[PDB]
Amino acid sequence: QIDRLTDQRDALREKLSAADNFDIQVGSRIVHDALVGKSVVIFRTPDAHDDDIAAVSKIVGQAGGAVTATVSLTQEFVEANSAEKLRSVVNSSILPVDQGSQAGDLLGIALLSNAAPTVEQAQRDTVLAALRETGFITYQPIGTANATVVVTGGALSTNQGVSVARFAAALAPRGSGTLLAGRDGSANRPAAVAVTRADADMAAEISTVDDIDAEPGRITVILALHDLINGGHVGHYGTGHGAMSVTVSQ
Amino acid sequence: KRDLYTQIDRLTDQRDALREKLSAADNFDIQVGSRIVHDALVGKSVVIFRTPDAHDDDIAAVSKIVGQAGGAVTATVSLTQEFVEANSAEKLRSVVNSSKLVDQGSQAGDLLGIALLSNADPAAPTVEQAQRDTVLAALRETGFITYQPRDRIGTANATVVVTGGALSTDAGNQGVSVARFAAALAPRGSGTLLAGRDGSANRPAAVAVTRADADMAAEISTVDDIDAEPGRITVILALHDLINGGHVGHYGTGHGAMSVTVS
């Protein structure tokens, strides 16, 4: 059994490298004009992978778009042991109840352009500085964006999934499209992609990709984000539970 | 005992996840194929030749991708077992003389190229329908080819010769005659590509024969993995590079491939 499983695995690893090579090489052709003139802000959870975010950022650029910022959500933010703390330092009511919704509404007004009063640079910088000072976020490097991708890791062991799904759902009405993307395993509870797909309201509001660890998933983030911005069309993609198909049907 | 069971579980988990990633890449490739080949063969016509070991699904995927690229397929011509066995050169010569003993593949490639391809040069004579039909019927009557459709096959700009995968060592005659056939078609149109299934990059298969010969490798493009979606799409992209850029390339995952697809 061990011999057959290792020979099968070794041959599959070789075959997958050729498949990944093809998809990386033709990626720019697949995403051509998908995000022309559009800006995207990326949010990442603590379990998100650098390589997944770098591949998504690169494909946004190949699609004619631009990334305004990468904002990291800290362990303190996702662990929801500070809803009262968040409101005490900065809340969405100061700009022109659960932690996820409140932070999504606040960061959405601050970083996304409503499809509403324009948020000036100083108000945005004050909001970002307050959240960083209190341990909620870190960020690189900030202008306003049209759309957003919230990137997570894969499976969660054990309400971190809920707070991130509610965070993404609260960002959605503040811009032209929100996509929640996770790695393989994110389509299983209690991860955020699974929470989103199991709730009729959230699944009709934001798109999801469950396999951002693979090249088809990284490309699909851009294609599905294009469908959100241009067509107002939501979709759930990948290889896990609740995925309607590996990628956009059109 | 527990370590052996843990090894089996971990190996099963790795193999299962790789199978899922590979099936997803094939499905992803099918869904985005039209985007990749968008406008690649606009206003161009392609004639397909197939050997007995070629697969219907590989040819249907190529024909479909040609159409998604804005092109059209004029005809599918089957080369028979008598053709690939390349032991009827004298008999073929007696047919070529009613349309030096030249090798069967080369003679047939030159004749079918004149009949089915439009020469890249405007001053070359146009082959009228009756001359084309007479040539096709003489080769069908003597057991060299069959073709679809039977009536009104038009002229094409480019060609794809489709084969199966690996050949046995004793089938060297079949690899050689098909590589020579494809090489002889090349000067008669705007581009010829020889595409085979996984294993075709190993000798004595036609793709392998082409890649190991300096002259043929410089004259026609090759794809060695037409059984996979990357290979089917690459046929159209590499055909585009031949017709529009005069650039030859050797693609796929086997010996002599410069890369999986065009750059």
Q: Are A187 and A220 in contact (CB under 8 A)?
A: no
Question: Does residue B257 lie in a domain region?
Answer: no
Q: Are A161 and A140 in contact (CB under 8 A)?
A: no
The sheet carrying B192-195 orders its strands as B145-148, B72-79, B45-50, B158-162, B192-195, B221-223, B250-251
Mutate to test the interface with A, among B260, B261, B262, B263 (most CBs of A within 10 A): B260
3-state secondary structure of B74: strand
Domain that holds residue A6: 1-30
Strands B72-79 and B145-148: antiparallel
Mutate to test the interface with B, among A32, A186, A246 (most CBs of B within 10 A): A246
Question: Does residue B260 lie in a domain region?
Answer: no
Q: Which two tokens stand for residue A245?
A: 């198909």
Closest in A6, A19, A238 to B22, CB measured: A19
Quick one: B84 and B14 in the same domain? no
Q: Are A229 and A177 in contact (CB under 8 A)?
A: yes
End-to-end CA distance of chain A: 42
CATH number reported for the structural domain that contains residue A160 in this entry: 3.40.50
In chain B, whose CA is at the least distance from the CA of A220?
Answer: B28
Place of tokens 């690899």: B175
A64: left (phi over 0), alpha (psi -120 to 50) or beta: left
Judged by CB atoms closer than 8 Å, whether chains meet at A12 and B32 is answered as: no
Closest CA to B240 of B33, B61, B69, B116: B69
Q: How far is A178 from chain B (nearest CA, A)?
A: 22
Q: Which residues contact A233 (CB under 8 A, 6 or more apart)?
A: A227
Residue A59 identity: I
Strands (DSSP E) contained in A39-177 are 39-44, 66-73, 137-140, 147-151
Q: Which residues on A lie below 8 Å from B3 (Cβ)? A: none
Q: How many domains does chain A have?
A: 2
Q: Which residues on A lie below 8 Å from B22 (Cβ)? A: 12, 15-16, 19
Q: What angle do CA B51, B222, B24 make, to 5 degrees?
A: 90
Round to whole Å and give the CA distance between A135 and A151.
19
Q: Which letter does DSSP use for residue A145 in this model? A: B
Place of tokens 């590989």: B58
Mutate to test the interface with B, among A2, A4, A5 (most CBs of B within 10 A): A5
Judged by CB atoms closer than 8 Å, whether chains meet at A16 and B15 is answered as: no
Q: Which residues on B lie below 8 Å from A20 (Cβ)? A: 25
Question: Does residue B259 lie in a domain region?
Answer: no
Question: Does residue A245 lie in a domain region?
Answer: no
Q: Write out the H or E segment, with its range, that includes residue B182.
A: helix B172-185
Q: How far is B139 from chain A (nearest CA, A)?
A: 40
Handedness of CA B16, B21, B22, B24 (dihedral sign): positive
Strands B192-195 and B221-223: parallel
Round to whole Å and give the CA distance between B80 and B146.
7
Q: How far is A81 from chain B (nearest CA, A)?
A: 35
Half-sphere exposure of B219 (CA within 13 A, CB side): 20
Closest CA to B108 of B124, B127, B130, B86: B86
Question: Does residue B97 lie in a domain region?
Answer: yes
Q: Are A232 and A180 in contact (CB under 8 A)?
A: no
Polymer length of chain A: 250
Round to whole Å and give the CA distance between A117 and A37.
21
Quick one: A216 and A155 in the same domain? yes
Q: What share of chain B is helix, strand, coil (3-state, %, to 5)?
A: 50, 15, 35
Half-sphere exposure of B190 (CA within 13 A, CB side): 21
Quick one: B148 and B229 in the same domain? yes
Quick one: A131 and A187 in the same domain? yes
Quick one: B25 and B99 in the same domain? no
Q: How far is A55 from chain B (nearest CA, A)?
A: 16
Q: Are A80 and A99 in contact (CB under 8 A)?
A: yes
3-state secondary structure of A100: helix
Q: Which residues contact A202 (CB under 8 A, 6 or more apart)?
A: A165, A168, A169, A195, A196
Residue A12 identity: L
Quick one: A186 and A134 in the same domain? yes
Q: How far is B18 from chain A (nearest CA, A)?
A: 6
Judged by CB atoms closer than 8 Å, whether chains meet at A9 and B27 is answered as: no
Judged by CB atoms closer than 8 Å, whether chains meet at B260 and A21 is answered as: yes
Query: From the CB of residue B49, how many other CB atoms can be counted at a distance below 10 Å?
Result: 29
Judged by CB atoms closer than 8 Å, whether chains meet at B28 and A246 is answered as: yes
A202: left (phi over 0), alpha (psi -120 to 50) or beta: alpha
Q: Which letter does DSSP use for residue A74 in this model? A: P
